[PDB]
mmCIF file of N, CA, C and O in Angstrom:
data_model
loop_
_atom_site.group_PDB
_atom_site.id
_atom_site.type_symbol
_atom_site.label_atom_id
_atom_site.label_comp_id
_atom_site.label_asym_id
_atom_site.label_seq_id
_atom_site.Cartn_x
_atom_site.Cartn_y
_atom_site.Cartn_z
ATOM 1 N N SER A 1 47.093 174.067 11.592
ATOM 2 C CA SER A 1 48.039 174.484 10.677
ATOM 3 C C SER A 1 49.356 175.242 11.457
ATOM 4 O O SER A 1 50.399 175.310 10.791
ATOM 5 N N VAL A 2 49.154 175.554 12.731
ATOM 6 C CA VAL A 2 50.217 176.070 13.560
ATOM 7 C C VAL A 2 51.219 175.020 14.079
ATOM 8 O O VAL A 2 52.383 175.272 14.473
ATOM 9 N N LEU A 3 50.800 173.733 13.963
ATOM 10 C CA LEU A 3 51.658 172.699 14.441
ATOM 11 C C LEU A 3 52.795 172.371 13.627
ATOM 12 O O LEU A 3 53.832 171.648 14.016
ATOM 13 N N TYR A 4 52.951 172.855 12.467
ATOM 14 C CA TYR A 4 54.126 172.451 11.472
ATOM 15 C C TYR A 4 55.346 173.439 11.845
ATOM 16 O O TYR A 4 56.274 173.298 11.064
ATOM 17 N N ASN A 5 55.293 174.404 12.729
ATOM 18 C CA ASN A 5 56.315 175.202 13.070
ATOM 19 C C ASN A 5 57.407 174.427 13.566
ATOM 20 O O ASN A 5 58.628 174.959 13.259
ATOM 21 N N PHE A 6 57.323 173.753 14.729
ATOM 22 C CA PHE A 6 58.383 173.114 15.383
ATOM 23 C C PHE A 6 59.235 172.145 14.620
ATOM 24 O O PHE A 6 60.535 172.224 14.382
ATOM 25 N N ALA A 7 58.567 171.212 13.930
ATOM 26 C CA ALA A 7 59.111 170.158 13.113
ATOM 27 C C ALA A 7 58.224 169.591 12.139
ATOM 28 O O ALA A 7 57.036 169.577 12.414
ATOM 29 N N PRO A 8 58.702 169.220 10.821
ATOM 30 C CA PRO A 8 57.771 168.415 10.090
ATOM 31 C C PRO A 8 57.555 167.201 10.577
ATOM 32 O O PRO A 8 58.350 166.439 11.130
ATOM 33 N N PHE A 9 56.274 166.628 10.230
ATOM 34 C CA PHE A 9 55.994 165.228 10.825
ATOM 35 C C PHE A 9 56.512 164.148 10.041
ATOM 36 O O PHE A 9 56.877 164.205 8.844
ATOM 37 N N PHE A 10 56.946 163.063 10.767
ATOM 38 C CA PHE A 10 57.559 161.947 10.205
ATOM 39 C C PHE A 10 56.749 160.642 9.875
ATOM 40 O O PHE A 10 56.904 160.332 8.590
ATOM 41 N N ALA A 11 55.856 160.308 10.651
ATOM 42 C CA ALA A 11 55.038 159.117 10.300
ATOM 43 C C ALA A 11 53.806 159.492 9.575
ATOM 44 O O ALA A 11 53.629 159.022 8.572
ATOM 45 N N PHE A 12 52.927 160.299 10.156
ATOM 46 C CA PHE A 12 51.731 160.999 9.658
ATOM 47 C C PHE A 12 50.628 159.878 9.349
ATOM 48 O O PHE A 12 49.459 160.247 9.079
ATOM 49 N N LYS A 13 50.874 158.611 9.396
ATOM 50 C CA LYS A 13 49.956 157.501 9.221
ATOM 51 C C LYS A 13 48.806 157.581 10.387
ATOM 52 O O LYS A 13 49.176 157.451 11.594
ATOM 53 N N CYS A 14 47.674 157.670 9.941
ATOM 54 C CA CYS A 14 46.655 157.685 10.981
ATOM 55 C C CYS A 14 45.441 156.587 10.624
ATOM 56 O O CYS A 14 45.118 156.477 9.452
ATOM 57 N N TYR A 15 45.041 156.009 11.686
ATOM 58 C CA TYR A 15 43.992 154.922 11.545
ATOM 59 C C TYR A 15 42.626 155.542 11.924
ATOM 60 O O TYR A 15 42.507 156.197 12.900
ATOM 61 N N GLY A 16 41.616 155.158 11.394
ATOM 62 C CA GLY A 16 40.400 155.510 11.515
ATOM 63 C C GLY A 16 39.893 156.806 10.900
ATOM 64 O O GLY A 16 39.561 156.887 9.768
ATOM 65 N N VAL A 17 39.842 157.805 11.651
ATOM 66 C CA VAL A 17 39.526 159.161 11.326
ATOM 67 C C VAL A 17 40.496 159.727 10.353
ATOM 68 O O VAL A 17 41.726 159.539 10.519
ATOM 69 N N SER A 18 40.226 160.444 9.315
ATOM 70 C CA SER A 18 40.968 160.927 8.207
ATOM 71 C C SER A 18 41.580 162.255 8.868
ATOM 72 O O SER A 18 40.960 163.195 9.166
ATOM 73 N N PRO A 19 43.000 162.347 8.927
ATOM 74 C CA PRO A 19 43.656 163.639 9.432
ATOM 75 C C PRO A 19 43.611 164.705 8.244
ATOM 76 O O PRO A 19 43.924 165.894 8.621
ATOM 77 N N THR A 20 43.244 164.352 7.046
ATOM 78 C CA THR A 20 43.285 165.413 5.908
ATOM 79 C C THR A 20 41.928 166.468 6.255
ATOM 80 O O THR A 20 42.213 167.571 6.164
ATOM 81 N N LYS A 21 40.782 165.850 6.512
ATOM 82 C CA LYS A 21 39.687 166.683 6.941
ATOM 83 C C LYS A 21 39.554 166.722 8.395
ATOM 84 O O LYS A 21 38.872 165.696 8.951
ATOM 85 N N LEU A 22 39.615 167.831 9.093
ATOM 86 C CA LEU A 22 39.422 167.925 10.495
ATOM 87 C C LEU A 22 38.753 169.247 10.905
ATOM 88 O O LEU A 22 38.385 169.424 11.963
ATOM 89 N N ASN A 23 38.682 170.288 10.006
ATOM 90 C CA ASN A 23 37.998 171.557 10.403
ATOM 91 C C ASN A 23 36.626 171.498 10.514
ATOM 92 O O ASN A 23 35.892 172.140 11.136
ATOM 93 N N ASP A 24 35.881 170.554 9.662
ATOM 94 C CA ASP A 24 34.619 170.270 9.731
ATOM 95 C C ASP A 24 34.036 169.246 10.898
ATOM 96 O O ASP A 24 32.816 168.983 10.841
ATOM 97 N N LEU A 25 34.822 168.764 11.567
ATOM 98 C CA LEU A 25 34.648 167.822 12.574
ATOM 99 C C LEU A 25 34.469 168.462 13.951
ATOM 100 O O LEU A 25 35.084 169.389 14.333
ATOM 101 N N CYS A 26 33.363 167.876 14.661
ATOM 102 C CA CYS A 26 33.247 168.387 16.034
ATOM 103 C C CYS A 26 33.290 167.314 17.105
ATOM 104 O O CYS A 26 32.713 166.298 16.843
ATOM 105 N N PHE A 27 33.880 167.559 18.261
ATOM 106 C CA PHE A 27 34.230 166.586 19.162
ATOM 107 C C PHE A 27 34.454 167.390 20.479
ATOM 108 O O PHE A 27 34.437 168.565 20.717
ATOM 109 N N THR A 28 34.754 166.490 21.539
ATOM 110 C CA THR A 28 35.086 167.206 22.919
ATOM 111 C C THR A 28 35.931 166.249 23.755
ATOM 112 O O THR A 28 36.039 164.925 23.436
ATOM 113 N N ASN A 29 36.559 166.806 24.671
ATOM 114 C CA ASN A 29 37.201 166.074 25.721
ATOM 115 C C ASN A 29 38.369 165.127 25.223
ATOM 116 O O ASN A 29 38.127 163.935 25.506
ATOM 117 N N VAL A 30 39.277 165.592 24.641
ATOM 118 C CA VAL A 30 40.303 164.832 24.001
ATOM 119 C C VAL A 30 41.321 164.747 25.133
ATOM 120 O O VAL A 30 41.907 165.529 26.057
ATOM 121 N N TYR A 31 42.279 163.680 24.984
ATOM 122 C CA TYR A 31 43.400 163.378 25.797
ATOM 123 C C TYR A 31 44.706 163.362 25.149
ATOM 124 O O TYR A 31 44.818 163.103 23.869
ATOM 125 N N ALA A 32 45.648 163.934 25.777
ATOM 126 C CA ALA A 32 46.996 164.119 25.252
ATOM 127 C C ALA A 32 47.975 163.640 26.188
ATOM 128 O O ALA A 32 47.959 163.839 27.454
ATOM 129 N N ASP A 33 48.983 162.887 25.617
ATOM 130 C CA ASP A 33 49.906 162.128 26.250
ATOM 131 C C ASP A 33 51.365 162.549 25.700
ATOM 132 O O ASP A 33 51.285 163.416 24.560
ATOM 133 N N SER A 34 52.455 162.059 26.052
ATOM 134 C CA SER A 34 53.755 162.255 25.532
ATOM 135 C C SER A 34 54.772 161.233 25.897
ATOM 136 O O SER A 34 54.894 161.045 27.066
ATOM 137 N N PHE A 35 55.334 160.615 24.929
ATOM 138 C CA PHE A 35 56.402 159.555 25.233
ATOM 139 C C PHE A 35 57.403 159.448 24.221
ATOM 140 O O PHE A 35 57.398 160.414 23.246
ATOM 141 N N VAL A 36 58.172 158.516 24.171
ATOM 142 C CA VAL A 36 59.257 158.324 23.269
ATOM 143 C C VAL A 36 59.397 156.989 22.460
ATOM 144 O O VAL A 36 58.836 155.912 23.209
ATOM 145 N N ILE A 37 59.676 156.832 21.290
ATOM 146 C CA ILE A 37 60.009 155.811 20.459
ATOM 147 C C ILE A 37 61.391 155.781 20.078
ATOM 148 O O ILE A 37 61.823 156.790 19.486
ATOM 149 N N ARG A 38 62.099 154.636 20.437
ATOM 150 C CA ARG A 38 63.594 154.673 20.036
ATOM 151 C C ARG A 38 63.943 154.630 18.671
ATOM 152 O O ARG A 38 65.020 154.710 18.341
ATOM 153 N N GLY A 39 63.103 154.315 17.779
ATOM 154 C CA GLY A 39 63.201 154.382 16.445
ATOM 155 C C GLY A 39 62.802 153.036 15.507
ATOM 156 O O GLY A 39 62.344 153.226 14.383
ATOM 157 N N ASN A 40 62.753 151.968 16.017
ATOM 158 C CA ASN A 40 62.635 150.618 15.350
ATOM 159 C C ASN A 40 61.350 150.048 15.759
ATOM 160 O O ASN A 40 60.874 148.911 15.369
ATOM 161 N N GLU A 41 60.523 150.757 16.575
ATOM 162 C CA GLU A 41 59.218 150.383 16.964
ATOM 163 C C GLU A 41 58.095 151.459 16.691
ATOM 164 O O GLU A 41 57.106 151.608 17.496
ATOM 165 N N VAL A 42 58.293 152.262 15.654
ATOM 166 C CA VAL A 42 57.354 153.169 15.228
ATOM 167 C C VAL A 42 55.963 152.555 14.862
ATOM 168 O O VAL A 42 54.820 153.035 15.241
ATOM 169 N N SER A 43 56.188 151.418 14.027
ATOM 170 C CA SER A 43 55.000 150.786 13.669
ATOM 171 C C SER A 43 54.306 149.817 14.794
ATOM 172 O O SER A 43 53.125 149.399 14.608
ATOM 173 N N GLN A 44 55.018 149.623 15.922
ATOM 174 C CA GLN A 44 54.361 149.110 17.054
ATOM 175 C C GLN A 44 53.444 149.793 17.923
ATOM 176 O O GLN A 44 52.758 149.348 18.572
ATOM 177 N N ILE A 45 53.372 151.090 17.553
ATOM 178 C CA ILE A 45 52.231 151.894 18.036
ATOM 179 C C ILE A 45 51.013 151.770 17.191
ATOM 180 O O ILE A 45 50.750 152.628 16.274
ATOM 181 N N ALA A 46 50.283 150.728 17.390
ATOM 182 C CA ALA A 46 49.154 150.299 16.542
ATOM 183 C C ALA A 46 48.405 149.142 17.238
ATOM 184 O O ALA A 46 49.076 148.551 18.035
ATOM 185 N N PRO A 47 47.172 148.981 17.154
ATOM 186 C CA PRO A 47 46.371 147.923 17.694
ATOM 187 C C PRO A 47 46.773 146.595 17.141
ATOM 188 O O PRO A 47 47.088 146.388 16.049
ATOM 189 N N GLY A 48 46.710 145.557 18.214
ATOM 190 C CA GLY A 48 47.040 144.215 17.693
ATOM 191 C C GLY A 48 48.455 143.894 17.657
ATOM 192 O O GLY A 48 48.966 142.814 17.415
ATOM 193 N N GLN A 49 49.448 144.799 18.027
ATOM 194 C CA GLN A 49 50.894 144.565 18.029
ATOM 195 C C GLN A 49 51.416 144.203 19.275
ATOM 196 O O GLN A 49 50.778 144.026 20.370
ATOM 197 N N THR A 50 52.530 143.485 19.179
ATOM 198 C CA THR A 50 53.226 142.701 20.399
ATOM 199 C C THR A 50 54.666 143.382 20.639
ATOM 200 O O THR A 50 55.011 144.194 19.809
ATOM 201 N N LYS B 1 25.749 119.525 9.329
ATOM 202 C CA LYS B 1 26.986 119.330 8.712
ATOM 203 C C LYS B 1 27.613 120.534 8.283
ATOM 204 O O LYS B 1 28.914 120.747 8.383
ATOM 205 N N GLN B 2 26.879 121.680 8.080
ATOM 206 C CA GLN B 2 27.413 122.926 7.701
ATOM 207 C C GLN B 2 27.947 123.592 8.767
ATOM 208 O O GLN B 2 28.697 124.845 8.687
ATOM 209 N N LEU B 3 27.756 123.175 10.076
ATOM 210 C CA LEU B 3 28.430 123.644 11.176
ATOM 211 C C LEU B 3 29.897 123.482 11.263
ATOM 212 O O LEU B 3 30.703 124.332 11.539
ATOM 213 N N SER B 4 30.208 122.348 10.764
ATOM 214 C CA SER B 4 31.685 121.788 10.668
ATOM 215 C C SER B 4 32.457 122.320 9.477
ATOM 216 O O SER B 4 33.674 121.940 9.217
ATOM 217 N N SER B 5 31.768 123.001 8.547
ATOM 218 C CA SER B 5 32.322 123.710 7.405
ATOM 219 C C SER B 5 33.316 124.793 7.674
ATOM 220 O O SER B 5 33.173 125.557 8.576
ATOM 221 N N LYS B 6 34.493 124.823 7.032
ATOM 222 C CA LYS B 6 35.534 125.826 7.284
ATOM 223 C C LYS B 6 34.981 127.210 6.791
ATOM 224 O O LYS B 6 35.420 128.221 7.501
ATOM 225 N N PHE B 7 34.311 127.406 5.771
ATOM 226 C CA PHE B 7 33.740 128.736 5.209
ATOM 227 C C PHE B 7 34.971 129.509 4.794
ATOM 228 O O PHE B 7 34.888 130.833 5.106
ATOM 229 N N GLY B 8 36.036 129.079 4.339
ATOM 230 C CA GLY B 8 37.195 129.821 3.958
ATOM 231 C C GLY B 8 38.156 130.250 5.219
ATOM 232 O O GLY B 8 39.075 130.853 4.843
ATOM 233 N N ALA B 9 37.799 129.634 6.270
ATOM 234 C CA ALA B 9 38.760 130.052 7.497
ATOM 235 C C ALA B 9 39.708 128.998 7.604
ATOM 236 O O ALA B 9 39.806 128.013 7.001
ATOM 237 N N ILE B 10 40.609 129.190 8.689
ATOM 238 C CA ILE B 10 41.769 128.311 8.957
ATOM 239 C C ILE B 10 41.118 126.908 9.566
ATOM 240 O O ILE B 10 41.569 125.837 9.092
ATOM 241 N N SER B 11 40.168 126.961 10.484
ATOM 242 C CA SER B 11 39.815 125.890 11.195
ATOM 243 C C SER B 11 38.123 126.079 11.480
ATOM 244 O O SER B 11 37.764 127.360 11.517
ATOM 245 N N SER B 12 37.397 125.233 11.654
ATOM 246 C CA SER B 12 35.916 125.342 11.895
ATOM 247 C C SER B 12 35.574 125.480 13.373
ATOM 248 O O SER B 12 34.545 125.567 13.760
ATOM 249 N N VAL B 13 36.731 125.263 14.323
ATOM 250 C CA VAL B 13 36.480 125.309 15.684
ATOM 251 C C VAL B 13 36.393 126.826 16.273
ATOM 252 O O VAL B 13 36.718 127.648 15.296
ATOM 253 N N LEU B 14 35.847 126.968 17.384
ATOM 254 C CA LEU B 14 35.666 128.275 18.020
ATOM 255 C C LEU B 14 36.621 128.639 19.110
ATOM 256 O O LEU B 14 37.303 129.757 19.022
ATOM 257 N N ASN B 15 36.691 127.759 20.083
ATOM 258 C CA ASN B 15 37.527 128.014 21.208
ATOM 259 C C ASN B 15 39.175 127.931 20.864
ATOM 260 O O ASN B 15 40.030 128.707 21.354
ATOM 261 N N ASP B 16 39.433 126.913 20.028
ATOM 262 C CA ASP B 16 40.792 126.675 19.761
ATOM 263 C C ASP B 16 41.334 127.675 18.790
ATOM 264 O O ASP B 16 42.362 128.189 18.801
ATOM 265 N N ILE B 17 40.448 128.454 17.738
ATOM 266 C CA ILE B 17 40.881 129.463 16.808
ATOM 267 C C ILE B 17 41.053 130.595 17.446
ATOM 268 O O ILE B 17 41.910 131.576 16.863
ATOM 269 N N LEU B 18 40.694 130.943 18.766
ATOM 270 C CA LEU B 18 40.859 132.246 19.398
ATOM 271 C C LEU B 18 42.311 132.272 19.891
ATOM 272 O O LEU B 18 42.890 133.419 19.946
ATOM 273 N N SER B 19 42.850 131.110 20.462
ATOM 274 C CA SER B 19 44.256 131.314 21.071
ATOM 275 C C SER B 19 45.269 131.434 19.853
ATOM 276 O O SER B 19 46.322 131.954 20.406
ATOM 277 N N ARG B 20 45.078 130.758 18.883
ATOM 278 C CA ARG B 20 46.160 130.705 17.846
ATOM 279 C C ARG B 20 46.333 131.844 17.025
ATOM 280 O O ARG B 20 47.289 132.143 16.285
ATOM 281 N N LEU B 21 45.232 132.850 17.060
ATOM 282 C CA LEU B 21 45.376 134.004 16.232
ATOM 283 C C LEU B 21 45.173 135.178 17.195
ATOM 284 O O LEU B 21 44.508 135.260 18.042
ATOM 285 N N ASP B 22 45.760 136.331 16.650
ATOM 286 C CA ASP B 22 45.690 137.719 17.295
ATOM 287 C C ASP B 22 44.402 138.229 16.993
ATOM 288 O O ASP B 22 43.743 137.930 15.849
ATOM 289 N N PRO B 23 43.836 139.035 17.845
ATOM 290 C CA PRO B 23 42.370 139.678 17.772
ATOM 291 C C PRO B 23 42.307 140.397 16.467
ATOM 292 O O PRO B 23 41.083 140.389 15.844
ATOM 293 N N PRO B 24 43.140 141.212 15.878
ATOM 294 C CA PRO B 24 42.923 141.915 14.752
ATOM 295 C C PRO B 24 42.640 141.024 13.511
ATOM 296 O O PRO B 24 41.926 141.668 12.508
ATOM 297 N N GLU B 25 43.160 139.833 13.525
ATOM 298 C CA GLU B 25 42.796 138.932 12.347
ATOM 299 C C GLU B 25 41.692 137.897 12.821
ATOM 300 O O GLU B 25 40.943 137.430 11.968
ATOM 301 N N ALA B 26 41.747 137.581 14.066
ATOM 302 C CA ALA B 26 40.610 136.589 14.588
ATOM 303 C C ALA B 26 39.152 137.266 14.536
ATOM 304 O O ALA B 26 38.329 136.638 14.388
ATOM 305 N N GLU B 27 39.155 138.677 14.783
ATOM 306 C CA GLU B 27 37.804 139.325 14.577
ATOM 307 C C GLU B 27 37.326 139.210 13.078
ATOM 308 O O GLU B 27 36.246 138.870 12.943
ATOM 309 N N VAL B 28 38.133 139.328 12.143
ATOM 310 C CA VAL B 28 37.897 139.105 10.783
ATOM 311 C C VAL B 28 37.564 137.765 10.509
ATOM 312 O O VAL B 28 36.503 137.408 9.556
ATOM 313 N N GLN B 29 38.316 136.743 10.908
ATOM 314 C CA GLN B 29 37.998 135.386 10.641
ATOM 315 C C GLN B 29 36.720 135.017 11.297
ATOM 316 O O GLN B 29 35.961 134.286 10.634
ATOM 317 N N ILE B 30 36.350 135.452 12.417
ATOM 318 C CA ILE B 30 35.097 135.140 13.136
ATOM 319 C C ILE B 30 34.010 135.942 12.524
ATOM 320 O O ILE B 30 32.942 135.168 12.325
ATOM 321 N N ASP B 31 34.173 136.994 11.948
ATOM 322 C CA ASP B 31 33.044 137.686 11.284
ATOM 323 C C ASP B 31 32.794 137.096 10.037
ATOM 324 O O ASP B 31 31.681 136.804 9.571
ATOM 325 N N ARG B 32 33.791 136.500 9.249
ATOM 326 C CA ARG B 32 33.609 135.714 8.089
ATOM 327 C C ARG B 32 32.936 134.560 8.282
ATOM 328 O O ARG B 32 31.928 134.001 7.646
ATOM 329 N N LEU B 33 33.281 133.778 9.355
ATOM 330 C CA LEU B 33 32.535 132.483 9.653
ATOM 331 C C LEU B 33 31.156 132.667 10.153
ATOM 332 O O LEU B 33 30.138 131.959 9.821
ATOM 333 N N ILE B 34 30.892 133.792 10.910
ATOM 334 C CA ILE B 34 29.445 134.036 11.384
ATOM 335 C C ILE B 34 28.701 134.430 10.156
ATOM 336 O O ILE B 34 27.410 134.011 10.116
ATOM 337 N N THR B 35 29.091 135.248 9.242
ATOM 338 C CA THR B 35 28.374 135.527 8.014
ATOM 339 C C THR B 35 28.095 134.242 7.171
ATOM 340 O O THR B 35 26.962 134.151 6.679
ATOM 341 N N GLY B 36 29.019 133.569 7.052
ATOM 342 C CA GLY B 36 28.819 132.287 6.240
ATOM 343 C C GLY B 36 27.895 131.299 6.945
ATOM 344 O O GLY B 36 26.889 130.777 6.310
ATOM 345 N N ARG B 37 27.797 131.158 8.326
ATOM 346 C CA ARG B 37 26.909 130.306 8.975
ATOM 347 C C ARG B 37 25.436 131.019 9.048
ATOM 348 O O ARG B 37 24.423 130.271 8.870
ATOM 349 N N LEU B 38 25.521 132.432 8.971
ATOM 350 C CA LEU B 38 24.258 132.943 8.960
ATOM 351 C C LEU B 38 23.570 133.007 7.521
ATOM 352 O O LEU B 38 22.354 132.759 7.359
ATOM 353 N N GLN B 39 24.359 132.950 6.448
ATOM 354 C CA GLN B 39 23.957 132.612 5.199
ATOM 355 C C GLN B 39 23.408 131.241 4.909
ATOM 356 O O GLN B 39 22.283 130.880 4.267
ATOM 357 N N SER B 40 24.086 130.254 5.609
ATOM 358 C CA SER B 40 23.514 128.826 5.577
ATOM 359 C C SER B 40 22.240 128.742 6.395
ATOM 360 O O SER B 40 21.309 127.906 5.900
ATOM 361 N N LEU B 41 22.089 129.351 7.523
ATOM 362 C CA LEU B 41 20.852 129.448 8.259
ATOM 363 C C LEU B 41 19.787 129.993 7.453
ATOM 364 O O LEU B 41 18.604 129.705 7.563
ATOM 365 N N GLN B 42 20.013 131.139 6.661
ATOM 366 C CA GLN B 42 19.112 131.859 5.810
ATOM 367 C C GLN B 42 18.661 130.870 4.763
ATOM 368 O O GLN B 42 17.339 130.897 4.423
ATOM 369 N N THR B 43 19.653 130.161 4.103
ATOM 370 C CA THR B 43 19.101 129.109 3.169
ATOM 371 C C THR B 43 18.209 128.000 3.803
ATOM 372 O O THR B 43 17.209 127.622 3.266
ATOM 373 N N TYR B 44 18.642 127.619 5.056
ATOM 374 C CA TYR B 44 17.787 126.608 5.632
ATOM 375 C C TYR B 44 16.361 127.145 6.021
ATOM 376 O O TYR B 44 15.368 126.276 5.819
ATOM 377 N N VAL B 45 16.287 128.262 6.465
ATOM 378 C CA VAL B 45 14.945 128.895 6.928
ATOM 379 C C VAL B 45 14.032 129.216 5.502
ATOM 380 O O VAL B 45 12.780 129.174 5.503
ATOM 381 N N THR B 46 14.725 129.623 4.430
ATOM 382 C CA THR B 46 13.960 129.761 3.212
ATOM 383 C C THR B 46 13.462 128.330 2.668
ATOM 384 O O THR B 46 12.109 128.358 2.252
ATOM 385 N N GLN B 47 14.225 127.293 2.774
ATOM 386 C CA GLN B 47 13.747 126.070 2.541
ATOM 387 C C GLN B 47 12.680 125.500 3.279
ATOM 388 O O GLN B 47 11.713 125.101 2.812
ATOM 389 N N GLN B 48 12.769 125.858 4.657
ATOM 390 C CA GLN B 48 11.729 125.430 5.609
ATOM 391 C C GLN B 48 10.479 126.324 5.337
ATOM 392 O O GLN B 48 9.294 125.810 5.476
ATOM 393 N N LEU B 49 10.556 127.547 4.993
ATOM 394 C CA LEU B 49 9.370 128.345 4.697
ATOM 395 C C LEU B 49 8.723 127.994 3.387
ATOM 396 O O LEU B 49 7.358 127.945 3.550
ATOM 397 N N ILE B 50 9.288 127.611 2.379
ATOM 398 C CA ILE B 50 8.710 127.116 1.144
ATOM 399 C C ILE B 50 8.156 125.690 1.393
ATOM 400 O O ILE B 50 7.075 125.471 0.902
#
């Protein structure tokens, strides 16, 4: 809930696990990266794309 | 004869159908073909059993 302070999310589409329910989920050792999308390849960040 | 059936897929071949299609749809097409051939094998072994 603290992640909404900087900017509202634009894409928000998530594959696989549901982003709506995350407080009841348990997991470990997550990876975090950071890069840029110039604007017309937002849908290109998906499996099977070229 | 049922090996050469299309089973609702684009082609009945295996090696050629991998190159022409991307994996996100090739996996679904292969899964459909495998389920159809397994159903045909189930019909064959039921006939053989009776």
